[PDB]
Amino acid sequence: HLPNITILATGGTIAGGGDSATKSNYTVGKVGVENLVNAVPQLKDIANVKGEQVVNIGSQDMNDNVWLTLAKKINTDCDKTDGFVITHGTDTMEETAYFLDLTVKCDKPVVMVGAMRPSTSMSADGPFNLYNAVVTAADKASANRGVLVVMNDTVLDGRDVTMTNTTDVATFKSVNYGPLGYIHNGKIDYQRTPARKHTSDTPFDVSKLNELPKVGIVYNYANASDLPAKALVDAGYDGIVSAGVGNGNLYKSVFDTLATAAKTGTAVVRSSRVPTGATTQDAEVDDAKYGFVASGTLNPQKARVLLQLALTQTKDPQQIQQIFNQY
Amino acid sequence: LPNITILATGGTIAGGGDSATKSNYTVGKVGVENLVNAVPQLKDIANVKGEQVVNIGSQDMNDNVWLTLAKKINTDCDKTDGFVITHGTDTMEETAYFLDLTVKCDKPVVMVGAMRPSTSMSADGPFNLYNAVVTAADKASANRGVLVVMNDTVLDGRDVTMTNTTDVATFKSVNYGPLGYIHNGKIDYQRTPARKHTSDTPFDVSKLNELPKVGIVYNYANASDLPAKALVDAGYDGIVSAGVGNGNLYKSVFDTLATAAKTGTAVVRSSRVPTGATTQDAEVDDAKYGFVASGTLNPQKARVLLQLALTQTKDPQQIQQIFNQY
Amino acid sequence: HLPNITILATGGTIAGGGDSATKSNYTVGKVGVENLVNAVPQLKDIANVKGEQVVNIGSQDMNDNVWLTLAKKINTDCDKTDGFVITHGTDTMEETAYFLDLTVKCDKPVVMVGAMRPSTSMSADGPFNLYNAVVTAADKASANRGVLVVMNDTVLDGRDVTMTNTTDVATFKSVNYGPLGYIHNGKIDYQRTPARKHTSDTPFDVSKLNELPKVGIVYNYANASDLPAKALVDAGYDGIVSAGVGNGNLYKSVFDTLATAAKTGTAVVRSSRVPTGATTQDAEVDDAKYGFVASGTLNPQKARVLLQLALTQTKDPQQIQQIFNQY
Amino acid sequence: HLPNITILATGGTIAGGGDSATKSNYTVGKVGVENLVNAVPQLKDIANVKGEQVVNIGSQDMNDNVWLTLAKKINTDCDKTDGFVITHGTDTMEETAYFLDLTVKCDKPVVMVGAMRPSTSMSADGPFNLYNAVVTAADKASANRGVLVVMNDTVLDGRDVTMTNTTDVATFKSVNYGPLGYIHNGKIDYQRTPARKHTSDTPFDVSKLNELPKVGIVYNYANASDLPAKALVDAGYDGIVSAGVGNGNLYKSVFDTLATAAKTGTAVVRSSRVPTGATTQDAEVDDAKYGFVASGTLNPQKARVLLQLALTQTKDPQQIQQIFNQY
C-alpha cells in the first residue's frame, strides 16, 4: 500500500568512511545497504524499502561488467517493485545514469543517488540525499522520465546530468537543459522531461550481452601527443571519443591519427572537453568527409556510453550520427 | 595615448566563412592590419602597431609558438606600453597561463579572441579587440599577470577557461571570478591573483627550444590503461591525469601511473570536473605514490605548470611546492 | 513558400541608437520596425516578413495598456500569419513574455527579441538576435511551446526566462528549468517544453478587458518599512506581491500589514527577491492560515503577471494558490 | 595553545528547529549558543570558544538596533579575543555582513555563518558550517580581508556575497567577483582579497549612534505604482534605493516621484533588481542632472546599507557617488 522500493547498492562515498568527522580523508566501501537504510528510519514513512548489495566499489572503478549486471537486474526484477534507487559513487554516476537511461526497459522510476561527504563526516549529505531519492522513486509522476539522478534536493535527467565541482555537495547539474524537478518537504514540482528517446524507446538490448564494444577517450590540448590515439587503434578498439578543444576541434597530430582510424574500421566521435554546449556539425570539421560523428551535447564520457551501444547495432558512421541525433 | 603592440597568432577572430548567417568558417583568412582597420576607434585610445607572429587555429597551438611568443614579449617589452595577443579561443586558456608564468614584462599583456568569425552577423571580435586595447592601455592592468579580455570582462590567465562550446560569453574564471568589468571604456578592478606570476616565477624560457614532454590521460568507467602506457613506453617526462571527481583514477590507470611514478615519471592528478580543486587528503595517498595534486588547475593548465616544473626538478615534493605557489 | 512572419515592434534598445559606436550612451524607441528589418537583408532567405509598429517605448515604461493592446492584436491577427516576432526592450521583456504566454490563444510561434547593445554599437547583438528570432518563429517545432524569448542563440520559455546580468549580451536565462533549445546554423534542437499550462490552455481571456486588476510589489530587507504595503492597501489594490527575504519571508511590520490585508479582501502572494528557487509552502510561514499564496518559482514581477490574471477569475486565496500551482 | 574565538549568536535557522528530521517545517531560535557549540565537540581541536547570545531573532526581523549593537560590541571586544564568529539567519546575512564590513574597526577575522537547514534536519548543514567559520576565524590569513561569510566550504567577502537560491545549502555566492578562498580539511587557500575599502579604511563611525538614517527600497516592474515611493517621501525618509529594471532603469511614475524628491533633498540611489552586474553611470539616466547616485554592483539591500552610512556624513549626491565608488 506504501510504494514498494528496491535499493540496489553499488558502493561510493555514501557508503564510505574516514577516521574523523572533521578531516577530509576517507576510503569507499565501509558500509552495507542495511546500515545506510537504518541511518534513515524515516524511509518507512514513505515506502516499504528492500535493499540489496550488488557490489561495493568506488565509482572511479565502475566498469562494463557492473553496468551489464545492473541493467540486467533492473530489467528482470522490474515487475517486483514500484521503483528502484541505486546508491552509487559520484565520480562516474553521470556515466552509469546514462548507460541505464538507454538500456533499462522498466518505465517505473529508477533513481541514482550518491554523497559528496562520507557517512562519517560532519553534515554528511548521504542520509537526506537517500531520503529524497526514495521520495523520487515513490512519486508516480517520476515514471516515464527516463533514469534519474537525485542530488541536493534536485531531480536531474540521466542524459544531461554531470558533475560541475570536484567537492561541492551541489555539484550535480543538468548543465545544458536544466533539471526536471525540485524536491521540497517530500513533494516534487516537475516542469520538464527529456525529449530524447530513452529506456523502452531505444533499440539497445544488453539482456544477452556479456561484453560491450571497446571505446576509449583521447584528450586534446596544445602540442597533444598522438600516442594515446595510436595505442587504442593499435589495440583494435571499436571506437574512440575525442575530448576536443572548443567546439570539438582536434590537435593536428591527433586529427591525422583519427582520420586514418575512421577510414580503417574504428568509429570516431568528436565531443569536447568544454563542459557545456554541443559539439556541432557546420563548424570547422566536415564529420562525414572523415567518417566522424559529432557528439552534440554529450560530453566525452557520455558520448562513450552511446558509442558503445551504437556499435552493438551498426559500424556505419551515418547510422551512428542518426543515433547521436535521437538518443 | 599609449603605444600598444598587437601580436597576432590567427584564430576565429581572424577567420571567415562564406556567409554572415551560417556557422561554417576557416581560421587564418585575415591578417593583423585588416583586423586593426576593422576597428578604427582604436585610434581614439592607442597608437596601435600590429605584427603577425603565426597564423594558425589555436587547436594547433604548440610548444614552439609558446616559446616564440614568450621570447618576443620579453625581448620587446621596453619598446611598447603594452601587448594584445589575438588568438584562437580553443586553447587561449593554455597560452594565457604559459605566458603568465614565463613573461617577465610586468606591463599589460592581454589575450583576446572571437567566438564568431569576422564575417558573421553581430561578430564579437571587433568590440573584443577594442576592449582588449582599453585593458592593455589602462596602467591599472600592470602587475596583474597575463590577462584575457572577452565579453566585456577582464579575466586572469591562471583561472580563465572556456565554459561553453559556442557562447560569446564562454570565457569565465570559474573558481575565483573576474578581476574587473569593462563599461564605456573603463575598468573597475576589484581583484588581482594572489598566485605568483610573470617576474615572481623562477621559470625562464629565453634559451629553450623545447619543453619537457607532458601528456594528458582521461579517466572514465572501464578506462583503458593503453594511453598512459603509451606515454610511459615513450619516456614522457610527465603525465597529467584528468581524474574523475576529486582527481580519482580508474584502477588500471592508477596502477600504470603508480609504477611510472616510481620509475621517475612525474604524475599530476587533475580532474575532468570543470570547477573546484583536485585536493590532497581525500582518497589518494599522494606522498605514498609520489603523485602531485593539481589544485584548481584543470588538466590542460596542469600540463603547462608541469612542463615548467620539469625544467627545474623531477622531485614530487618539489613539484607539489610549485603547484602550491604558481 | 517561405513562412509569413509578422514583426510587431514595441521599441527597445534593438530600435535604439547612440551618438557613438564605442561609448555606452543610447536612447530607446529611437527608430522603427521597417528600419530594423532593412538592417538584416538575410531575413528574406528564411521568411516573408511584414512589420507593424505597435508602440515605441523603452520597456522600463512598459504597462498594462501596451500588454492588452499586444495580446488582442496577436489573437486578432493570428489567422493571417505563420508566426510572430515582437521587438521589445530587454528590461521588462521577461514580464511581457509571461503576460503574453498566459493571454495569447494563437499557438503559432510567438517569439520576443531584444538587444543588450545599441544599433550603432561595435559588435551590435540586435541584428543576429533578430535573425535567430525569425528562425525560431519560422520553425514548425516552435508551435505549442508557449511564448518564447530568443536571445544569445538560445530559445527560452516565457515563464522561466529572466535577466541574470545588467549589461551582458548573454543575460537572458531560464534560471530554474533551463532553456528549450539552442540555435546553431539556423536550426534548433528542441529537447524541452514547459509543463505549466499556457496560451490556449489558460482560462485567461483579455479580449474584452480594457484594464487589469491593480497589483503592486513591495520589497523586504532589514528594518523594512510597512509604508509601501500600507499605501497599496489604502489605495484599494486588488493584490500585493511580496519580494520576501530568503524563502519568501516577511519583515515583522510587513507581515503585520499583509496578514491584516489578506483577511479583508487583498490577495497576497509571497515571492522572493532571491533570483532562483521556489518560494515554498511548508517552511516558516503557514500560508493557508494567513490566506497567503506561495509564488513557487515565479519571481516578484512574474508572480504580479499571474496574480493580476488570477484576479480576473477569482478573489479566493485557495483558488489563487491553485492557479499558482497550475500556470 | 589554540586561538581564542568569540561566537556572537543572533539566532536564525542555524539555531532553528522543526518536529521532524525529514519534514521542511521549522522555526528560528529554538537552540541557544552553548547548545550549538556542544553539538560540534571538534571545535576544541581548533580553538578555545566563548559564546554570547546577543539577540535571538529570525534574520527576516533584522533591524538597525541589532546592527549597532553588533558593531559596537565587536569594536569594544576586539582586544579581548583573537577572532569573531557571528551566527545569524541566512535571509539578511548579506545585509549584516555589509554593515559590519563598513563599521567594524577590528581587523582581526570577523566571520558570519548560518544554515539553510534547521539544526534538527537530516543532513543539517549548520554543524560543519560553524566548524568552518571557526576554522576561518582561527586563520590569521583571514585578518585584514574585511567582514566574511563562510558557507558551504567557501570564504565570501561581505560586500559581494549574496543569496542565489531560496533553499540551496550552496546559495551564498560572491556573484560578481567571486569568492576569496575554498576550505578543505580545515585549511583555506586564499587567492583573492576585496580591493573595495572595508573596516578600519572606512570613515563610518557608529560608536555614539543609536539610530540610522531612514532608507527604503522601491521595486520597478511594468506599470509600477508611485505609492511606495510617495509613502517613503511623505514619511520624510532620508534616502530611497530603487531596485531598477535592467541597468538601474525606473518605471515612468517611480522616476517622476524620485526625481521630485531628489530635487528637495532625498538621497536616491539607482540599483537593479537584476542579480549580477553593475548599475552604471552614462547609460539611459543622467545621474548628475537628477541628483541621483548609481549603485555599481551593490544590489538594492546592499545599496541601502552604504546609503544609510553615507547619510551619517553627507546628504550631497555627488559626495554620496564618490562614497559609492570607494566602498
UniProtKB/Swiss-Prot annotation, chains A, C, D:
- Name the InterPro entries for this protein: AsnASE_II, Asp/glu_Ase-like_sf, Asparaginase/glutaminase-like, Asparaginase/glutaminase_AS1, Asparaginase/glutaminase_AS2, Asparaginase_C, L-asparaginase_C, L-asparaginase_N
Question: Which residues make up the binding site for substrate?
Answer: 59-60, 90-91
Per the UniProt entry, the Enzyme Commission number(s) are 3.5.1.1
Catalytic activity as recorded in UniProt: L-asparagine + H2O = L-aspartate + NH4(+)
What GO molecular functions are on record for this protein? asparaginase activity; identical protein binding
Per UniProt, the enzyme's principal EC class comes to hydrolase
Q: Residues in domain Asparaginase/glutaminase?
A: 3-327
- Name the domain of life: Bacteria
Could you name the active-site residues? 13
Q: What more does the record tell us?
A: E.coli contains two L-asparaginase isoenzymes: L-asparaginase I, a low-affinity enzyme located in the cytoplasm, and L-asparaginase II, a high-affinity secreted enzyme.
Q: What is this protein called?
A: L-asparaginase 2
Q: Which organism is it from?
A: Escherichia coli (strain K12)
What does the record give as the organism's lineage? Bacteria, Pseudomonadati, Pseudomonadota, Gammaproteobacteria, Enterobacterales
